[PDB]
Amino acid sequence: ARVSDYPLANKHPEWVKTATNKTLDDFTLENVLSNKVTAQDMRITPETLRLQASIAKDAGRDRLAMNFERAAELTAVPDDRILEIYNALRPYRSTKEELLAIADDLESRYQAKICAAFVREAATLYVERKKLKGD
Amino acid sequence: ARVSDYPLANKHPEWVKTATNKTLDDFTLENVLSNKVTAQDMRITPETLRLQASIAKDAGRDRLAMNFERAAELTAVPDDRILEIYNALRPYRSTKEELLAIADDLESRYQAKICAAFVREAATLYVERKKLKGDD
Amino acid sequence: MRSKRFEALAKRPVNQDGFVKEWIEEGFIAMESPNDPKPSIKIVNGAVTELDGKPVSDFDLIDHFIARYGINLNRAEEVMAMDSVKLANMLCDPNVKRSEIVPLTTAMTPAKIVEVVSHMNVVEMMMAMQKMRARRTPSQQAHVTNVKDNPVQIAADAAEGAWRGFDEQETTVAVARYAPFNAIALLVGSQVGRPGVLTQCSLEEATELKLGMLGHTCYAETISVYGTEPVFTDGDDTPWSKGFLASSYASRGLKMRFTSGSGSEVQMGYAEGKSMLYLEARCIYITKAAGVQGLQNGSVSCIGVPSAVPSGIRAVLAENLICSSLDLECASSNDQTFTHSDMRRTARLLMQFLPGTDFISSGYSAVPNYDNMFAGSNEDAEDFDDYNVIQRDLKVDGGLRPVREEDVIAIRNKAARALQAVFAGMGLPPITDEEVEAATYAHGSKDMPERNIVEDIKFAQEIINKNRNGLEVVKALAQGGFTDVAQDMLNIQKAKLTGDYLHTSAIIVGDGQVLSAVNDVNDYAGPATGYRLQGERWEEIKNIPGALDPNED
Amino acid sequence: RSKRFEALAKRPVNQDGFVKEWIEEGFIAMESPNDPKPSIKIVNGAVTELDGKPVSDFDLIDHFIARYGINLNRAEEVMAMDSVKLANMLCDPNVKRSEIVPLTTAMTPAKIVEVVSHMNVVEMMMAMQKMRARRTPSQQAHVTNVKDNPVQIAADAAEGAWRGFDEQETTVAVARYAPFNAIALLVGSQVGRPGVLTQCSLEEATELKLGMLGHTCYAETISVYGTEPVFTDGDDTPWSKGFLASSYASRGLKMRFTSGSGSEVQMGYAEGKSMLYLEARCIYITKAAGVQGLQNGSVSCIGVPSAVPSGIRAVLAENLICSSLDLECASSNDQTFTHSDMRRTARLLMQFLPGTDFISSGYSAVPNYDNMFAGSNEDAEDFDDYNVIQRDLKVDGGLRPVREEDVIAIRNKAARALQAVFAGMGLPPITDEEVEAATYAHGSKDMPERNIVEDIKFAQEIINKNRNGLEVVKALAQGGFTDVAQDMLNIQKAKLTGDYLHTSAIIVGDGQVLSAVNDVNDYAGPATGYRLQGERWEEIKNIPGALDPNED
Amino acid sequence: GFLTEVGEARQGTQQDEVIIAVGPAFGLAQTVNIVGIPHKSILREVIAGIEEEGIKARVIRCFKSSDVAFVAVEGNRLSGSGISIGIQSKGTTVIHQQGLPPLSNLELFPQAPLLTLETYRQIGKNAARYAKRESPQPVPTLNDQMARPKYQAKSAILHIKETKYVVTGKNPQELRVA
Amino acid sequence: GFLTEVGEARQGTQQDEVIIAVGPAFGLAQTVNIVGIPHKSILREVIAGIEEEGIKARVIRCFKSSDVAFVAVEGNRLSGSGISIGIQSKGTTVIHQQGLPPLSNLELFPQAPLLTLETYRQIGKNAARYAKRESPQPVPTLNDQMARPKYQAKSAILHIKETKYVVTGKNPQELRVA
Ligand code: B12
Ligand code: B12
Ligand SMILES: CC[C@H]1O[C@@H](n2cnc3c(N)ncnc32)[C@H](O)[C@@H]1O
Ligand SMILES: CC[C@H]1O[C@@H](n2cnc3c(N)ncnc32)[C@H](O)[C@@H]1O
Ligand SMILES: [Ca+2]
Ligand SMILES: [Ca+2]
Ligand SMILES: [K+]
Ligand SMILES: [K+]
């Protein structure tokens, strides 16, 4: 996808699905009132986030794109787990092995390769800068 | 004179005379208290105004220069006559020939040749635009 | 005897402000400090080995984050070698396009870009800002709060704010557990005034994200970053925990930005002897390095620190310019009181208002300042007419418009009624017709009947405790007779699914049409180019109240 | 009724005057569809067509501008250049001022209006800091009071000079007071800082007579207008004003014209044209006459452009046209127009941020209740706000913070010097009690009353007996003020050299003339041109209330 | 409707009267001054002040211009005492005297918003006292520096509307006041 | 000269006490708070507010940090009830509890200029009521929006000076008060 394809809601609404594989046009007030759709398919998909990442790159914003790529992986991580991982990246909360185990969980359970690498990098530099538990 | 000669007070104070042929150096407090100089000596010369016109040209200000060249001519015109001529150029004060008479006076009596042309121009266009005496 | 001239001067409001002389050694200096590091970078392939005089073995977590993620390494060594005065010249040169500059400015180190803008006066910074701002059209963000957390008033104030032209609106609470009601009331009220307005509820960082997973907010902003490792650690965070939290928001389809601001580090006493502007640049590169799309900066709540020292307000403009030059959306503060003087706060506002930023204020108070739960903004609701007159005087689009009183009465009334049906359709404590009337004609919370806070608190908690989501709000609107408001609410949630508005400077205008720095790129190239106030927008800003028509004169 | 709109209705700005545009009658600040398309026709050294008008249809203003007002060397070349391109060059930091002035002086009035009309106020301010004639910006003050009390005038003038004003302006409530106001202002100014130029604004003929007596240094309120009916109803023509201008220079007196947007439509004779176009005509009259500078920016008609859209932007545009035509610009900010502090600060910042030759042409150095020009946009009670903003933004607004004991000492010396002048000239005495009151006054509410009748009789005798400025010098040298007397003589000596007749000239240091000739603005972008730095910066930094960290 | 033209105004010959000269739209297209004071009450107070001093008041309408000074010059050229009062529709007032230059005057009132009915009565009193060759203290008005900013644009609109009733070369008409 | 260290502060073993933890410069390099209230009076009010609720007040000086949060964290680690009060030299005060995250608190007073001796005494009461496992109403303070920007610069100066007395890796010292 390029900047010509932006915005998706106007150029390609048929390209946007939901985390329960419903299309975008299903989001009419009729389907809401019948409980034919409810809160959980109101969740952005990793495919959508990777399309925006591609568009961010075409617009010359590599870092924004990488943020979107991390976001695409984290759609698979439950709400409570997200907050647990965030809290553990805070200084003096974790040892180095705990952070490495967190990245292991991210990779092996949620296919979150970019977020795992990001967490392992943190673990390495928290050693260098003494931001680990017990420091 | 060029911009390098500006200001005259710093670069050429010896060039600066007064209309009564006094120098800048004469204007000390001792001469003022003794009345060896008076207010009638405190008048800029046509030479000084013409040096300043030449400096304005070097600085790219042609119209400023022309105003200075007219002012150099008007230094020789007495105070009351200056006011008389200003009043005559105001609308509906003068006929065409009084303006031309003023222009003739400026040229022949005070050598004010730029001002004469300036006034003759006024006389001509005051006819075209109905600004003379008896036109309102 | 005392001079009566100086007595009169001693009574002036400006002399109640706080001023101090510079303390260079401790970093109590806005900018241009002799302690700031000389620009330097060592690259070739892969990674950085020296950043602004610091070797890689000496990097703190911030140097690492910036070195690995924050600099366009493709051009760093080329732009490091360019003369800083020439680079400043290009910034404000109208014939060097934004798209030619961004590769270079993103390639400078923090000390390089600080050195570059330090050669500029405020006129030059303003000239550069109107080119470097990411979104072509400028906009505005408002605070919508009241001292009682009255949800009916928040909805009506949000509708008026949206009707005046605010494209983002922000709320917070006096009482912590009111927050779910504030978020819902702000969101409903905003969509009533103009569908597409984005809403946030600023809370503690974990509680804010939970409200976003429920669907009651659109964006988040108060995630803070800091410019020295000690201050960042004393904030109980690292760049990696902030970056992970940033991608967490995007993963839930929520636009977010960071908040920083000059003066935060010296206030904590750990500026490491550096100037406020140098430390703020570090914050901006942290934001860029995290992949966050924009930043709320311009000292913000620390404004009393740079405003006390020489060149402090110029420095605040400089940090806004650095933010935009780094291709980030800039929400340029003007959201906190700092002076007793109207002249002084106008001059500070004008720095961003005249060029335009993505959000001229990141918190214009849409309520009277006594109701402002961020402890007061640089502008409040009583300045609206002045703000509109200056727009008309200068032909400057400052994001707002004049409005008719009866239109605002009609839109506040509808917003109050819309929220009354939401509270009915979700089983929340009732909104009485008396509260609807009062919020329609209110100026602030002084005009509103008191509510049962203890009962309101209990039901608002039960919204997060039972995971009651934004689709229940849509249903209640559809069923209380507000199907037009219900569809707009569904369009807002549908925008979260597309991710279009996660992009730089994104807002939603018209009928669900996203407007961001992707499709509304700033293309300024001098006079008669870029954004010009003209056409129907100009006619809207022209039509201020009190403008007598000659045909009735 | 909405309490929100009640609160807004109580706001001071809602007491200002606003009207919708009336295009047909010229009640529009700029960008009118009625303004002429630029055009020029040159046949053998003379203009035969100007901005759509043939020479047979010229009015006196067209004739004056066509014959003296336009650089005909490049007029046809610049007429064919794209107006946006030219507006781009105006605010481009890499196009030198000396490259632009040949082009702007070759533009017709409609051409330059069209050019600047492409600019927003940020672009206009960016052009102003390059196009301003003098490198260093400056400030001019009003020094008046409701009683024409000469002791208070001298004291306020000394304070104004000490705060940094380089030109100071007075006028009278009672017309026959004028000689006393002129002398008091001149003596007071020289005491606060030798070199400050003074003027006393009166009817045109009376003002030139005062200048011939040596009691003033310059004149400014000589008006020009943008349509022939309005000019005629002012009882003048361009030739009578051009002659008056050269008369001032022939006596060694600096002078400038005054104009301002709104004057023509206020008289009802805008001829369907916008305020900005008519002011451009006023500016070209000034250029054509050879006058070095112009007081413009609406001035006393400020309530006319400020009532209509883009009016204040238009005020900035006219200042920018003035400087672009290589004229000194005294950019107004000298008249009240709004009840709102925010609105009048925005209006001041248009000139204060880039800097003009005189950021204001009349900052009130007295409280506005004493302002005999009916109130300025800024007055004495704004002094501390003005210095804080210089410090906040690192902008040189031409003023500086001052110590109370220093102002007390300089107001005392000035009141005592005028006491010696009044004694040596046989004028109604100035008592020590009047000196004490003038020393500590805020305004005339703090001064003992004088016998206005006796004062009037003796001030008239100064004119009727042709009593000149040299007698003032003699009175100072003989009453214990030789130092003040020498400074007054040096001021009179400046009229002999003609150095301060040039564009933007002021007198700084020890009689050093500083003008656009030797202090040429050389702006070429950031870190070039004038920059606030060094000792001037340390001066502006040191506001009252700035606590030192070692104190704390 | 309270003013009737009775023919071209005659030349006064006795130092006996003061001429009130009003603009071409006074009492017709405009019936109140800038702040809503009726033209009928304005004229009545000025006439009352003149007659209170034992002097006759003669009202004329000028058509050649709408500038208050030139309206007053037309008045003082016909006035038997050489004294006239010029009043524009929006309220601006001048006391003028035959022999003075057109733009000079005895007293000028250049802020119409600051005139009250009492001020207009004093204006008539002073004018008659000028006609009796006395030197009265100029009429005082209240001071208000915001009056000019607040009313300048409305003043210009009202002046443009009166200017539409100018007629070139039409002599002044004597008026009969109800 | 009213504070005196008396050795390393012991950890309280019974739920009998509230610890008042003061900053490094408290009552030494600075003797008044941001608005002139003497440190001695501040200490006496907080102490008395605690003891009026039947709870002993122990005072310690912290050294590892000048941050009011971490000063009170050191306090509540040694408080037998787990309740501590952190007080900086410039006057910022926080009521903390062991087990709360370091940047959380029971009650925070982040505008030292708006604090009176009334508030300081009331802070002592509420801390002891927290130690007695009661749920007191939060301490009410005055409100002034101008207070933050008016004093932020001076508080930064005072904080910087107090930070000069931080000594790494030094445990709190108990103090005796006069
Ligand atoms: C704006 C203004 C002008 C404007 C508009 C005049 C117009 N006729 O429309 C301009 C710049 C064109 C102007 C020109 C002149 N003005 Co003028 N003007 C003012 C000013 C600053 C404000 C008046 C105002 O806005 N009042 C508020 C409005 C709402 O009330 P208003 O009653 O409608 O005001 C009208 C009158 O004031 C009238 N007016 C303005 N100036 C003059 C001058 C004379 C002689 C007359 C009869 C009327 C007049 O114009 C206003 C609108 O129409 C006053 C000073 C003051 N602050 O009062 C000087 C002032 C009234 N002007 C004065 C003078 C001297 C002149 C000129 C002769 C100057 C000149 N040599 O060109 C001309 C006369 C032109 C003319 N035929 O009327 C003097 C009058 C002195 C006197 N007692 O005789 C004043 C008092 C200034 C002063 N410092 O002495 N003026
Ligand atoms: C400026 C400010 C900051 C600044 C400077 C803080 C500092 N220590 O120097 C910055 C941006 C760095 C900051 C950071 C934080 N702040 Co803060 N801060 C403010 C603010 C807006 C104004 C305080 C002020 O200027 N007062 C005027 C001065 C003259 O009085 P003062 O007594 O000297 O003020 C000092 C204290 O307020 C202290 N302080 C400031 N923030 C915080 C937060 C905590 C937990 C503590 C213990 C102390 C503290 O710093 C000031 C001077 O050093 C207040 C809002 C408010 N209502 O006042 C929030 C506020 C006090 N901060 C708050 C928070 C949440 C934080 C952070 C935890 C945010 C974060 N997650 O990073 C950190 C904690 C930093 C720390 N280790 O203390 C909350 C406190 C909530 C609570 N009851 O615990 C407040 C009330 C904002 C809010 N509306 O929620 N803050
Ligand atoms: C109470 C600190 C909080 O206030 C906000 N804030 C205001 N100003 C600043 C600032 N200058 N730097 C960082 N954060 C700031 C931000 O949300 C932060 O978490
Ligand atoms: C009372 C008219 C006088 O006021 C001065 N003045 C103020 N504003 C303007 C203006 N806008 N145009 C011309 N002259 C002006 C000028 O000295 C003129 O003679
Ligand atoms: Ca905000
Ligand atoms: Ca002036
Ligand atoms: K910062
Ligand atoms: K004009």
Q: Which chains touch A (3 or more CB pairs under 8 A)?
A: C
C-alpha span between A8 and C498 (Å, rounded): 6
Indicate whether residue C222 lines ligand 3 (CB < 6 A).
yes
Residue of C297, C292, C214, C205 lying closest to C255 (CA atoms): C292
d(CA C202, CA C224): 12
User: Which technique was used to obtain these atomic coordinates?
Assistant: X-ray
HSE on the CB side for E124, CA within 13 Å?
Answer: 28
Rounded distance, CA C160 to CA C401, Å?
Answer: 11
Q: Which residue among C234, C305, C339 sits closest to F152, beta carbon to beta carbon? A: C305
> Among D92, D442, D544, whose Cβ lies nearest the Cβ of C93?
D92
Q: A92 — alpha (psi -120 to 50), left (phi > 0) or beta?
A: left
The whole-angstrom separation of Cα D161 and Cα D38 is 44
Instruction: Categorise residue D56: left if φ over 0, alpha if ψ from -120 to 50, beta otherwise.
Output: alpha
Catalytic residues of D: 140, 142, 169, 220, 295, 334, 361
Report the distance separating Cα D515 and Cα B7, nearest Å: 9
Whether the Cβ atoms of residue F140 and residue F114 lie closer than 8 Å to each other? no
Distance CA(D285)–CA(D222), nearest Å, equals 12
For residue C314, the CA-to-ligand 5 centroid distance in Å is 21
F109's tokens: 């007073």
Cα distance between the two ends of chain E? 9
- Each as own residue / partner, the long-range contacts of residues D406-409 (CB below 8 Å, 24 or more positions apart, any chain) are D406/D162, D407/C3, D407/C5, D407/C6, D407/D159, D407/D162, D408/C3, D408/D439, D408/D440
Cβ–ligand 1 distance for E162 under 6 Å, the answer no
User: Which amino acid is located at D17 in the chain?
Assistant: G
Structure tokens, B98: 């009084």
Residue F1 burial (CB < 10 Å; 0-12/13-18/19+)? exposed
Residues A18 and A48 sit within 8 Å (Cβ to Cβ):
no
Cβ pair C293, C329 in contact under 8 A: yes
From C224, C234, C277, C378, mutation site for ligand 3 pocket: most ligand atoms within 8 A of C-beta: C224
d(CA D231, CA C54): 70
Atom of ligand 4 nearest to the CA of D221: 17
Domain limits of chain A? Answer: 1-43, 44-135
3-state secondary structure of F93: strand
Crossing angle, helix B62-74 and helix B96-110, to 10 degrees? Answer: 80
Amino acid letter, residue C65: F
Tokens of C219: 């964006």
The contacts of residue D30 (CB under 8 Å, 6+ apart) are: D113, D117, D274, D275, D276, D277, D310, D313, D314, D317
E93 by DSSP, 3-state: which? Answer: strand
* CB-CB under 8 Å, A70 with C247: yes
D198 beta partners = D168
Q: How far apart are CA C384 and CA C527, in angstroms?
A: 29
Active site residue C84: no
D6 is in an annotated binding site: no
Q: Would you say C142 and C154 are in contact if contact means Cβ atoms under 8 Å apart?
A: no
Rounded to the nearest angstrom, the distance between the alpha carbon of D300 and the centre of ligand 4 is 6
Q: Locate tokens 């107006």: which residue?
A: D83
Extents of the domains making up chain E:
1-178
AA letter at A18 = T
Do F168 and F4 contact (CB within 8 A), yes or no? Answer: no
| Residue C405 contacts residue C544 (beta carbons within 8 Å) | no
Residue with tokens 């790494």: F168
Tokens for C489?
């609410």
Residue B51's CB: how many other CB atoms inside 10 A?
22
Chain E contact for C546, CB < 8 A? no
Report CA dihedral (E117, E119, E125, E131) to the nearest 10 degrees: -120
CB of C104 sitting under 6 A from ligand 3: no
Task: Starting at the earlier edge strand, list the strands of the sheet with D167-170.
Answer: D197-200, D167-170, D140-142, D361-364
How far is residue D248's CA from residue A121's CA, in Å, rounded to a whole number? 79
Most informative mutation of F30, F65, F68 for ligand 2 (most atoms within 8 A of CB): F68
Closest ligand 1 atom, residue E86 Cα: 47
- E165 CA to centre of own chain: 17
Q: How far is CA C445 from CA C154, C171, C185, C497, F144, in A?
A: 9, 15, 15, 36, 17
List the resolution, Å: 2.3
The answer to whether D140 is annotated as binding is yes
Measure CA of the first residue to CA of the last residue in chain B; give whole Å: 47
On whether any CB of chain F is under 8 Å from the CB of D45, the answer is no
What are the domain boundaries of chain C?
A: 1-553
Q: How far apart are CA D321 and CA D119, in angstroms?
A: 12
Asked if residues B26 and B37 have their Cβ atoms less than 8 Å apart, the reply is yes
Q: With beta carbons less than 8 A apart as the criterion, state whether D274 and D315 touch.
A: no
Q: Is C141 a catalytic residue?
A: yes
Give CA–CA dist F89/F109, Å, rounded. 14
C405 in contact with chain D, both atoms CB, cutoff 8 A: yes
E157 in contact with C, Cβ within 8 Å: yes
Note the helical H segments in B23-136.
29-33, 46-58, 62-74, 79-88, 96-110, 113-128
Of D156, D544, D546, residue with least CA distance to D364: D156
Distance C259 CA to ligand 3 centre (A): 6
Q: Which two tokens stand for residue D422?
A: 């009044």
Catalytic site residue from C115, C157, C221, C397: C221
Is A90 within 8 Å of chain C by CB? Answer: yes
Nearest to D161 by CA among D129, D127, D135, D195: D195
For the CA of F72, the nearest atom of ligand 2: 47
Q: What pairing do the DSSP bridges indicate for beta strands C507-509 and C513-515? A: antiparallel
- Nearest ligand 1 atom to the CA of E105 is 84
| CB neighbour list of residue C445: distance below 8 Å, 6 or more residues apart | C146, C147, C148, C150, C153, C371
The phi and psi torsions of F177 (rounded to 5 degrees) equal: -115, 145
Tracing tokens 């409980």 back to the chain, one arrives at A35
Ligand 2 neighbourhood includes F151 CB (under 6 angstroms): yes
Which residue of chain C comes nearest to A45, CA vs CA?
C497
B102 interfaces chain D, CB cutoff of 8 Å: no
Nearest alpha-carbon partner for C200 in C208, C192, C210? C208
- Map D199-238 to HEC letters: EECCCHHHHHHHHHCCCCCEEEEEECCCCHHHHHHCCCCH
* D335 pocket-lining for ligand 4 (C-beta < 6 Å): no
Verify whether ligand 3 is closer than 6 Å to residue C228 (CB atom).
no
Separation of alpha carbons C500 and C478, rounded Å? 26
Contacts of E161 in chain C (CB under 8 A): 553
Say if the Cβ atoms of A89 and C210 lie within 8 Å: no
To the nearest whole Å, the CA of C371 is away from the closest chain F CA by 11
Q: What residues form DSSP beta bridges with C258?
A: C223, C295
How far D489 CA sits from the closest chain B CA (Å)?
A: 8
Cβ(C254)–Cβ(A75) below 8 Å: no
Question: How far, in Å, from the CA of D157 to the mean position of ligand 6?
Answer: 15
Question: Nearest-CA neighbor of C177 among C465, C426, C436, C373?
Answer: C465
D302: CB partners within 8 A, 6+ apart: D260, D262, D315, D332, D335, D336, D337, E149
Gap from CA of C221 to ligand 3 centroid (Å): 10
Structure tokens at B35: 């009345």
The C-alpha atoms of residue C89 and residue C128 are separated, in whole angstroms, by 9
Ligand minimally distant from the alpha carbon of residue C171 = 5
Please, which residues bridge with residue D141 across strands? D168, D363
Q: Which residues of chain B neighbour D236 with C-beta distances below 8 Å?
A: 90-91
Cβ distance of D493 and B39 shorter than 8 Å: no
Shortest alpha-carbon distance between residue E157 and chain C (Å): 7
- What's the CA gap between B36 and B33, in Å, rounded? 8
Would residue C335 show up in a list of annotated catalytic residues for this protein? yes
Residues in chain C: 553
